Amino acid sequence: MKLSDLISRWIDVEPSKNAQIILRDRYFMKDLDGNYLETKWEDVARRVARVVATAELLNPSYKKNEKLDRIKEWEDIFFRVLKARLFIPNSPTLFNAGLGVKHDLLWKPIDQMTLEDYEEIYRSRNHLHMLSACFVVPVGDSIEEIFEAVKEYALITKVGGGVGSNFSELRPKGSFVAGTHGKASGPVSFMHVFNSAISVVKALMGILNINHPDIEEFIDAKKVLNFFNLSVGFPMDKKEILKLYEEDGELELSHPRSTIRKKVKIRELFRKIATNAWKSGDPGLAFLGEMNKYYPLYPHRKINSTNPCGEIGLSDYEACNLGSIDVAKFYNNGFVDLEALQELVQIAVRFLDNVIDVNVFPIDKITKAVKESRRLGLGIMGFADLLYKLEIPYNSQEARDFAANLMAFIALHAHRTSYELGKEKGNFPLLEISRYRTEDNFVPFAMGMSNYDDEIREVMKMTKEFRRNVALLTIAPTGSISNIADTSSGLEPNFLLAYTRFVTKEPLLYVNQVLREKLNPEILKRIEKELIEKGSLKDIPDVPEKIKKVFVVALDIDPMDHLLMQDAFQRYVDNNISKTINMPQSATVDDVLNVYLEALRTNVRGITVYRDGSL
Amino acid sequence: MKLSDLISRWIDVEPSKNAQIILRDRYFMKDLDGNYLETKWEDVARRVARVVATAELLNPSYKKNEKLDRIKEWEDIFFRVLKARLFIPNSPTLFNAGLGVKHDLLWKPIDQMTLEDYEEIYRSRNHLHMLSACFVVPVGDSIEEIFEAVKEYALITKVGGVGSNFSELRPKGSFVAGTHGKASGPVSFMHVFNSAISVVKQALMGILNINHPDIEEFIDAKKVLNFFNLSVGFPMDKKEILKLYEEDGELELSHPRSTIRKKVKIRELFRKIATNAWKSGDPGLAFLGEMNKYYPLYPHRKINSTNPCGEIGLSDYEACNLGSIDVAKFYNNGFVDLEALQELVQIAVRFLDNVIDVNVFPIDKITKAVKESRRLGLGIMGFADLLYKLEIPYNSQEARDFAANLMAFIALHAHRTSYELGKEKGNFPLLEISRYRTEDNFVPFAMGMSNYDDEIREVMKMTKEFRRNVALLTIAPTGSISNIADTSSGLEPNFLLAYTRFLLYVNQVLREKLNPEILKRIEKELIEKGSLKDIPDVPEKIKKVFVVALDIDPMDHLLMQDAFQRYVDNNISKTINMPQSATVDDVLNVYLEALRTNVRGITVYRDGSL
Ligand SMILES: Nc1ncnc2c1ncn2[C@H]1C[C@H](O)[C@@H](COP(=O)(O)OP(=O)(O)OP(=O)(O)O)O1
Ligand SMILES: Nc1ncnc2c1ncn2[C@H]1C[C@H](O)[C@@H](COP(=O)(O)OP(=O)(O)OP(=O)(O)O)O1
Ligand SMILES: O=c1ccn([C@@H]2O[C@H](COP(=O)(O)OP(=O)(O)O)[C@@H](O)[C@H]2O)c(=O)[nH]1
Ligand SMILES: O=c1ccn([C@@H]2O[C@H](COP(=O)(O)OP(=O)(O)O)[C@@H](O)[C@H]2O)c(=O)[nH]1
Ligand SMILES: [Mg+2]
Ligand SMILES: [Mg+2]
Numbered sequence A: 001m002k003l004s005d006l007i008s009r010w011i012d013v014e015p016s017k018n019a020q021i022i023l024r025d026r027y028f029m030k031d032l033d034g035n036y037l038e039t040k041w042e043d044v045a046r047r048v049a050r051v052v053a054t055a056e057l058l059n060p061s062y063k064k065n066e067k068l069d070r071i072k073e074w075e076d077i078f079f080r081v082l083k084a085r086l087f088i089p090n091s092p093t094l095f096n097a098g099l100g101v102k103h104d105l106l107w108k109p110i111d112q113m114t115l116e117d118y119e120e121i122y123r124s125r126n127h128l129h130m131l132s133a134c135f136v137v138p139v140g141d142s143i144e145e146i147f148e149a150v151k152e153y154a155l156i157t158k159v160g161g162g163v164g165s166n167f168s169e170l171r172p173k174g175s176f177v178a179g180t181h182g183k184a185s186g187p188v189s190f191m192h193v194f195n196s197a198i199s200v201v202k203a204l205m206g207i208l209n210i211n212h213p214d215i216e217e218f219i220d221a222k223k224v225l226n227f228f229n230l231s232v233g234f235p236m237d238k239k240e241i242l243k244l245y246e247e248d249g250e251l252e253l254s255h256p257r258s259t260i261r262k263k264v265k266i267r268e269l270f271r272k273i274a275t276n277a278w279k280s281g282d283p284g285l286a287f288l289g290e291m292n293k294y295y296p297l298y299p300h301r302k303i304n305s306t307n308p309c310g311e312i313g314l315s316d317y318e319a320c321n322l323g324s325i326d327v328a329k330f331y332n333n334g335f336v337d338l339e340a341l342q343e344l345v346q347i348a349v350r351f352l353d354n355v356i357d358v359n360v361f362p363i364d365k366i367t368k369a370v371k372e373s374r375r376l377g378l379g380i381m382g383f384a385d386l387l388y389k390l391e392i393p394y395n396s397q398e399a400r401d402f403a404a405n406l407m408a409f410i411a412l413h414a415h416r417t418s419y420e421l422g423k424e425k426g427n428f429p430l431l432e433i434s435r436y437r438t439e440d441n442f443v444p445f446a447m448g449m450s451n452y453d454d455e456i457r458e459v460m461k462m463t464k465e466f467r468r469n470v471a472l473l474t475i476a477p478t479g480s481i482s483n484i485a486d487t488s489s490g491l492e493p494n495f496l497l498a499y500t501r502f503v504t505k506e507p508l509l510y511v512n513q514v515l516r517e518k519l520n521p522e523i524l525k526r527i528e529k530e531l532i533e534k535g536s537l538k539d540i541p542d543v544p545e546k547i548k549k550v551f552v553v554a555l556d557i558d559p560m561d562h563l564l565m566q567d568a569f570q571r572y573v574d575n576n577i578s579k580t581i582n583m584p585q586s587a588t589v590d591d592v593l594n595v596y597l598e599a600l601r602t603n604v605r606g607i608t609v610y611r612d613g614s615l
Numbered sequence B: 001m002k003l004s005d006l007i008s009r010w011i012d013v014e015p016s017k018n019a020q021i022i023l024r025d026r027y028f029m030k031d032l033d034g035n036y037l038e039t040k041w042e043d044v045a046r047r048v049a050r051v052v053a054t055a056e057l058l059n060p061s062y063k064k065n066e067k068l069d070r071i072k073e074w075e076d077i078f079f080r081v082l083k084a085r086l087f088i089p090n091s092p093t094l095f096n097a098g099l100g101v102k103h104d105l106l107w108k109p110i111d112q113m114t115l116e117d118y119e120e121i122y123r124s125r126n127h128l129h130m131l132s133a134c135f136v137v138p139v140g141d142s143i144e145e146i147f148e149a150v151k152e153y154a155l156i157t158k159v160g161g162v163g164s165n166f167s168e169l170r171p172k173g174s175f176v177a178g179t180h181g182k183a184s185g186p187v188s189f190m191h192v193f194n195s196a197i198s199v200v201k202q203a204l205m206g207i208l209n210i211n212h213p214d215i216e217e218f219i220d221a222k223k224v225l226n227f228f229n230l231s232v233g234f235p236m237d238k239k240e241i242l243k244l245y246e247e248d249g250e251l252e253l254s255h256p257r258s259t260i261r262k263k264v265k266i267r268e269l270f271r272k273i274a275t276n277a278w279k280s281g282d283p284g285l286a287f288l289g290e291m292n293k294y295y296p297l298y299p300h301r302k303i304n305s306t307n308p309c310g311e312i313g314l315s316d317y318e319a320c321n322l323g324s325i326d327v328a329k330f331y332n333n334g335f336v337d338l339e340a341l342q343e344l345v346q347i348a349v350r351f352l353d354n355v356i357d358v359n360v361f362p363i364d365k366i367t368k369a370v371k372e373s374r375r376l377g378l379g380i381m382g383f384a385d386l387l388y389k390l391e392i393p394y395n396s397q398e399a400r401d402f403a404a405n406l407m408a409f410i411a412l413h414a415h416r417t418s419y420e421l422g423k424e425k426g427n428f429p430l431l432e433i434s435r436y437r438t439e440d441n442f443v444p445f446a447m448g449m450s451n452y453d454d455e456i457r458e459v460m461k462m463t464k465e466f467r468r469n470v471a472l473l474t475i476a477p478t479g480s481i482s483n484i485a486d487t488s489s490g491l492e493p494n495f496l497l498a499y500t501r502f503l504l505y506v507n508q509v510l511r512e513k514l515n516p517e518i519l520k521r522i523e524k525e526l527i528e529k530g531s532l533k534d535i536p537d538v539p540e541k542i543k544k545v546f547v548v549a550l551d552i553d554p555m556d557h558l559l560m561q562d563a564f565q566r567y568v569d570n571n572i573s574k575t576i577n578m579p580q581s582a583t584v585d586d587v588l589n590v591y592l593e594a595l596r597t598n599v600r601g602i603t604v605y606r607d608g609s610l
Helices: A003-010 A017-026 A041-058 A066-082 A091-096 A116-121 A144-159 A188-196 A238-246 A266-280 A288-294 A338-357 A364-373 A385-391 A398-424 A453-460 A522-536 A545-550 A559-571 A591-600 B003-010 B019-025 B041-058 B067-083 B091-098 B115-123 B145-157 B185-201 B215-221 B237-246 B266-279 B287-290 B338-358 B364-372 B383-390 B397-425 B431-435 B455-460 B508-513 B521-529 B542-544 B554-565 B586-594
Strands: A087-089 A135-138 A161-166 A204-209 A227-234 A251-256 A261-265 A284-286 A319-324 A374-380 A497-502 A509-511 A579-583 A607-612 B087-089 B135-136 B161-165 B202-209 B228-232 B250-253 B262-265 B285-286 B303-306 B311-314 B318-325 B376-381 B575-578 B601-606
Touching: A003 A066, A041 A066, A041 A116, A041 A338, A066 A087, A066 A116, A066 A338, A066 A385, A087 A091, A087 A338, A091 A319, A135 B542, A144 A161, A144 A188, A144 B145, A188 A204, A188 A227, A188 B185, A204 A364, A204 B091, A204 B554, A238 A266, A238 A288, A238 A591, A251 A266, A261 A266, A261 B586, A266 A374, A266 A591, A266 A607, A319 A338, A319 A364, A338 A374, A338 A398, A374 A497, A385 A398, A385 B091, A398 A453, A398 A559, A497 A522, A509 A522, A559 A579, A559 A591, A579 A591, A591 A607, B003 B067, B003 B338, B019 B041, B019 B091, B041 B067, B041 B091, B067 B087, B067 B115, B067 B338, B087 B338, B091 B318, B135 B303, B135 B311, B145 B161, B145 B185, B185 B202, B185 B228, B202 B215, B202 B303, B215 B228, B215 B266, B228 B303, B237 B266, B237 B586, B250 B266, B250 B383, B262 B266, B266 B285, B266 B586, B266 B601, B287 B303, B338 B376, B338 B397, B364 B431, B376 B397, B383 B397, B397 B455, B397 B554, B554 B575, B554 B586, B575 B586, B586 B601
Parallel strands: A135 A161, A161 A204, A204 A227, A227 A284, A319 A374, A579 A607, B135 B161, B161 B202, B202 B228, B228 B285, B318 B376, B575 B601
Antiparallel strands: A087 A319, A135 A319, A251 A261, A284 A607, A497 A509, B087 B318, B135 B318, B161 B303, B250 B262, B285 B601, B303 B311
């Protein structure tokens, strides 16, 4: 089917009542009187579309005469595509698009739009029209830098971004300084200033490397640092670490600018991490090494840290804007409609590329970084619900293969578009010095799970000359936009099939739409209460097999099947993937370690685990 | 007696065992293995004397061919005055002078020094060569400026004490034309500063104006910010606030970037301040308005904060280096040796003024605000011990008249030294646009309790043409330097006559004027009861004279602060000590009196509080 026909099937469907509460809450614009400028999703769509379309001015391929009706093509498409809720950019894009712009340009009917209107939009974008979500900033070994980073966190947060850092440069607690001669506080201490800053500018990523002398104390640093997610950094190769472990080897903890040295059994270090994650979900693992392995600019540039949820490895001062396709709405008669998914990837990658052009950053080292690489994060949401529609159990193999294929297709046409764009609009500045140029068989992910592999290699070849973006794909958690879209989040399985929203306060008993659209209505009413008490189908009498096997939830799916699904997707994603490894209450410390080890033998770039009943 | 004879009396009097312990712990320079480069107070004195003498390199009135002689004469006068402990610069000067300078150079004999040697000292001063106690930084109403400020706190603290007025920060809940938000408030924002300092190894000043919407929350913000002293700012005239209180009127709380506004009874507010001070000692009162009244650069520059102990009111990015004279060493047969004192005062001013030129700051706008104003903080210590020798009770009008004359004489000669350095080296860049120039009869303290006033008036007039410094005087706490000097602290009475602190003292003047054996006898009781008051079979004359802090009532405390402040161009560190049984009304009563006197701030501590 044609995108245009699918759009016509979605465009007049309004968001549900649950999304609407969310929209009125933080998403509809409010004039300084506290009033409402937007009252319906449609309006937000109009605003965002118009503004993102605006980046077409900067297009060297357009002449004049043509430029107007042209931007009026992209605004309509972008518009149609977001009204349908077929593609949605990260929240920042939706809050801040067109802040600074005059209130009568943003919503006026399109065929009253003039060329000068779109130039005015371009110019009126103020210092809070920050349309991206992920940032990383460094924190060098120095006070001037430490406290400049605290300032940077604040400002990025003011504008609605999430940021992280590797703190491994900070010399250990106890070090010599002069300096001052007072002794170095250590990174775990300095992270308190980071924590305190954000407590007052109303989540962050904090990484320390496994070989830092203070690591043991970091692993323990939330037993506080309540605005931090913490992960343990592995900048060496995965294989190197897995080896050392299986030999019961020892690790040298040391730092360039100190004389503090220690040796620890790596198994014990892992046990310490495992226990704390077992206890409370922190810290995660970040396989920095593995991220660099696939980084076009490594070792010229370096990936040292992820943003708060791990899904973008970013170099210093680099940011990345994201958005996601609801693959659930591409379900056509037992198949994913590839003909409509392709056009939309085409459309989405241009949209996201356009965002960068209309974007404003609090710190122009970040503006620089961004213009230089133009790293995007096209992803998906609604995947679990799509598995539902296709009758594929999440925890299966079929599911992972399908996943790998879906992702592979998207990867393909996403990059083919970075191509057609690097042609039409000019290469991302740093192409030349990238592994796309000086390498040969450079692929920004592992592959090995799809037919599309060979076509992908070609394209990465056609990409030695034309390429708008260092990278293009990710899988975000989509905590909010999957809500807006009425669909499951990112690549996660549904946590529950049924729960109780309270109206604001009344029992509104929500059941998953697809469960409704498939399981018998009488059956449902019987089981409902029990489903909500147990949070799963599996132990419920008189529900057919077909259905318990298809409509699995996160806790129905064992840790390993989670891990392996993450692997399938990482194989065709250039950035990382946000994935919680859910573990049953009855899981042990050993169970966590085993997850960790498996993670080591797969192509996952990080690890988050969550034990049910932990916190 | 000439200063140089005075010097000969004290130069060989060894720092006491207690003083020497302190010197080792934190003043004697150590080499890069924790070995001792300095083992004697004399070494400190040499090093500091020489570094500061080096400033003479930049003297425009010396020809290149007299410089070496002049530089060495200053090192020598500085060295002697310091070894004798007649005058001592603020700790940072002790800690840091000479950092970055080859060792073979700091302590070498003066006879052997060349013009090149001084030049090598001047040019090898590193970024830790930070010689000032007191800083104030602005904290403007943006995320940008708030976190810049925090980084400055970090930086100053890493090398230094700092205060801010947080009043620019829109009230908690305010509209943020920035974004979705609601401004967090000055108080929460101050938590970032406390947290930064909890982590940078080196006390902080936090001020919020009485009429900022968050003042109530502020006043309670320590009923944490464990690193802050807090004060209420009164930017408006002291008279105006007294009137309001007497009329039982109301104060509007507002902020130029908020719609948050509220009315409060000034009395209930004051009583709340006082209630907390009564419990805990915080917050103090900072009479900003009264600091601006005497601020030569007002209204073009403005004073919004003090440093941590409140003794220097400073404009944005301004820093100030302190130094104190031990006035007890000036006692001579019933009198203060005013001849000797005047010479030291001239030296002490040049010394402090030279410290500027060899001082390195960690932020260029401080370098600039200091070069432009050249504010000094010459003060006194040993005042209480002096009174003992003079047989004058601290709690009497006799002491306070003595204090005013004493401080008036010092003020006199200091401003007169400032004229002379103005003439010899050049005026403080902003002389031309200050009230010493653009206004007649301007005086930067209230005067009014000395025969020296007239004389001070005309030195101020003369200072129309030449003036090296916008301001010269303070009275600092002198917590550590008065120990280095074996004397009493600032203008404070001795807190105790005999006491063990971490071991044993016993007041040296009391040792000297008390009948021994009937010291031995009573010594047990005094050491526990903490006063001579209720020990019998001790005069009387001794009882009257040898009073301690808790023997002196709060008004006698406060009026001594008044007496000195009439003759100090900056402010004054004085604790108004209250007995345990004092009441919240006794504290209000202090404040009311504070408002009538010429005091520039208030600190109260009730015995038994914390
Ligand atoms: N005063 C301090 N207290 C605690 N830690 C400090 C202090 N000053 C610096 N540190 C920590 C911060 C960094 O982790 C590290 C480097 O400090 P920095 O400000 O760079 O000193 P420096 O660079 O002048 O001396 P160094 O050459 O030793 O790095 O030590
Ligand atoms: N996200 C936030 N959380 C808490 N307080 C904030 C936040 N953002 C700003 N503030 C407070 C900090 C300052 O006191 C005040 C000013 O913020 P600031 O960054 O100056 O906004 P702005 O200058 O961009 O716009 P404006 O000054 O016109 O409101 O608001
Ligand atoms: O409340 C939030 C949620 C997310 N993020 C950041 O936005 C990224 C994308 O998260 P998600 O897709 O879950 O957010 P959404 O765009 O659906 O609101 C996260 O990894 C974080 O870097 C953030 O700063 N604040
Ligand atoms: O630990 C300290 C003690 C004092 N001061 C500063 O020095 C001023 C005066 O302190 P004092 O005279 O007691 O210090 P000393 O010169 O005796 O070391 C204070 O208000 C602060 O500005 C500081 O920065 N850190
Ligand atoms: Mg450094
Ligand atoms: Mg602002």
